[PDB]
């Protein structure tokens, strides 16, 4: 009984997708297939710095008058950038649907990058990075990406190195903007109280101008030892399947089974036919090795001794999860934008439920043995990590002598 997500396509290739609902406020966003993976180490912070500059005024709406408009209807303006996708989204009322779309049009095209602003946003970005190091789990996940995807464009961070940040100019930005903002790589997603025909007419009216035009995991280890920190963050991952491979669903159930360290989180990060599947835990130094041992045992148990009850529990946790999420308008629009960018279509919740209920214990331990057993992991540690075991002990913990 969930309403279907209807997708149309303009000549430009900008797929305009919408999923109407009763709620009177909507989350209209633009999703662009452009991240740090498309950068070539000479413009490693171009997407981040453009994400900073995108709200500082356009040609038609110069400066803060633009954001005065998004204050005037009381709407909320957000943007984010990952290694593969960039999103500019607005939460607003339903009756303010046209102007919001027009605002989004300016943000993607006709944007103005002021040289004055460029210096101010450089100091913002530089400073934030200079303090970003504070967030450990971000440092650990960046270290994990770097050591797992050495030599590839997937190792480099979204923010880029301070070097590039300082060394960036309007023209470079202009390039990234004019290169990675093509209309066939763009989705206009709407969720909530929107009509699809009105949104399609608004996309035809504005946004109809957008121009139309080997990933490798390396089993490795990075250890940033700094003994003055009170807690240690350790992430261990193996290679993921990618977006389009359905056993992701089964792997999600495996994560739902795992769900000793103060904080233990499992992740399945997916990129275009690659990814990182693993666990991040933050712990006191004198516990670290025991955690690792614990964690590896659970993975091998999922490779060898999965039972039906924990599989049923993981399926229930996954169902609830995906359905708990996909609740508010934003979460949904976000799903529409990512689904049109990655799968090329919006997968409905009934298909997700079918793919969940076809998962049993035998195929779960088969897929877990395919992806976890006897695999070389990527390890990233930060903090008092002397008792964190080196690569032979972790690699030996990636299998059992008793199977």
């Amino acid at each position: 009984s969930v309403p279907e997500t209807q997708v149309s396509i303009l000549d430009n290739g900008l797929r305009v997708a919408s999923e109407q609902s009763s709620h009177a406020t909507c989350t209209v966003g633009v999703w662009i297939d452009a991240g740090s993976r498309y950068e070539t180490e000479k413009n490693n912070g171009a997407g981040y710095f453009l994400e900073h500059l995108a709200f500082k005024g356009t040609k038609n709406r110069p400066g803060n008058a633009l954001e005065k408009e998004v204050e005037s209807i009381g709407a909320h303006l957000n943007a984010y950038s990952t290694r593969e996708h960039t999103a500019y989204l607005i939460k607003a009322l339903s009756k303010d649907l046209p102007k919001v779309v027009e605002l989004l049009a300016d943000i993607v095209q006709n944007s103005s990058l002021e040289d004055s602003q460029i210096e101010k946003e450089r100091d913002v970005i530089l400073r934030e990075m200079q303090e970003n190091d504070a967030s450990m789990q971000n440092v650990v996940f960046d270290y994990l990406h770097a050591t797992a995807f050495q030599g590839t464009p997937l190792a480099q961070a979204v923010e880029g190195p301070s070097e590039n940040v300082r060394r960036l100019s309007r023209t470079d930005l202009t390039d990234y903007l004019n290169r990675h903002y093509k209309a066939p790589r763009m989705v206009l997603a709407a969720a909530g109280g929107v009509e699809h025909q009105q949104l399609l007419d608004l996309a035809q009216k504005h946004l109809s101008s957008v121009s139309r035009v080997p990933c490798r995991f390396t089993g490795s280890e990075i250890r940033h030892r700094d003994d003055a920190l009170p807690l240690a963050h350790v992430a261990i991952a193996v290679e993921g399947p990618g977006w389009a491979n359905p056993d992701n669903v089964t792997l999600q159930v495996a994560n739902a089974i795992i769900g000793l360290c103060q904080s233990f989180q499992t992740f399945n990060i997916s990129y275009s036919d690659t990814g990182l599947l693993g666990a991040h835990f933050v712990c006191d130094a004198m516990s670290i090795d025991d955690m690792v041992f614990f964690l590896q045992g659970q993975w091998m148990r999922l490779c060898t001794s999965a039972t039906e009850s924990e599989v049923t529990r993981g399926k229930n946790i996954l169902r609830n999860a995906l359905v708990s999420h996909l609740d508010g308008t934003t979460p949904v629009c976000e799903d529409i934008g990512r689904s049109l960018l990655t799968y090329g279509r919006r997968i409905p919740l009934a298909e997700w439920e079918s793919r969940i209920q076809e998962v049993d214990a035998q195929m779960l331990r088969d897929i877990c043995s395919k992806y976890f057993y006897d695999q070389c992991p990527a390890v990233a540690g930060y903090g008092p990590i002397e008792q964190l075991p080196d690569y032979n002990r972790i690699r030996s913990g990636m299998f059992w002598l008793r199977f």
Partner: protein
């Protein structure tokens, strides 16, 4: 006693060839120094089995294959080769008692060794003069091993007497003085 030897060591951990505090760089033993010990065991077994299966009497004495005759004395009496250095020293000292004592000291001088360390650096990796003195010590230890074999006659005796004098003077006198000189060269003393 070897179990006590291992205990008195783990309290302090093993040393490294640079002689520095290796606390910043330590690794496990199971996968790194176990396969290394297994490889060393294999090489030692290779040398032991090529000593047993190919040259089983190159280190022993032929006269041990005769039965023990109390009436017949051999023309030349030796212990087995690893006692030779001591044998030389014993023979060198004219006095019987002196020989016995020196002999004992030969082994005991080692125990005395931790009180003779006068350098601010633990290892000899960065100490070339004491390296030269150490290899001269290994050299005249080999000389004393050879002399023991040689019979009692000129000039084997004199070498034995000198070699023993040089052995005790290098261990007792020359190495701490050299360590003081090496500390003076680094502007430490």
């Amino acid at each position: 006693l070897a179990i006590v030897h291992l205990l008195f060591l783990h309290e302090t951990g093993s040393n490294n060839p640079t002689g520095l505090n290796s606390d910043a760089d330590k690794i496990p033993f199971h996968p790194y120094y176990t396969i290394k010990d297994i490889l060393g065991i294999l090489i030692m077994f290779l040398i032991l089995m090529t000593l047993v299966l190919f040259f089983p009497d190159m280190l022993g004495d032929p006269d041990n294959y005769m039965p023990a005759n109390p009436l017949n004395t051999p023309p030349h009496i030796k212990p087995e080769w690893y006692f030779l250095f001591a044998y030389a020293i014993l023979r060198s000292i004219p006095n019987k008692l002196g020989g016995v004592l020196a002999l004992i000291l030969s082994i005991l001088i080692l125990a005395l060794m931790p009180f003779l360390h006068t350098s601010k650096q633990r290892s000899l990796m960065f100490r070339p003069i004491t390296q030269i003195l150490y290899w001269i010590l290994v050299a005249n230890l080999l000389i004393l091993t050879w002399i023991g074999g040689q019979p009692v006659e000129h000039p084997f005796i004199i070498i034995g007497q000198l070699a023993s004098i040089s052995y005790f003077s290098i261990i007792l006198i020359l190495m701490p003085i050299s360590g003081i000189i090496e500390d003076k060269m680094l502007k430490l003393y």
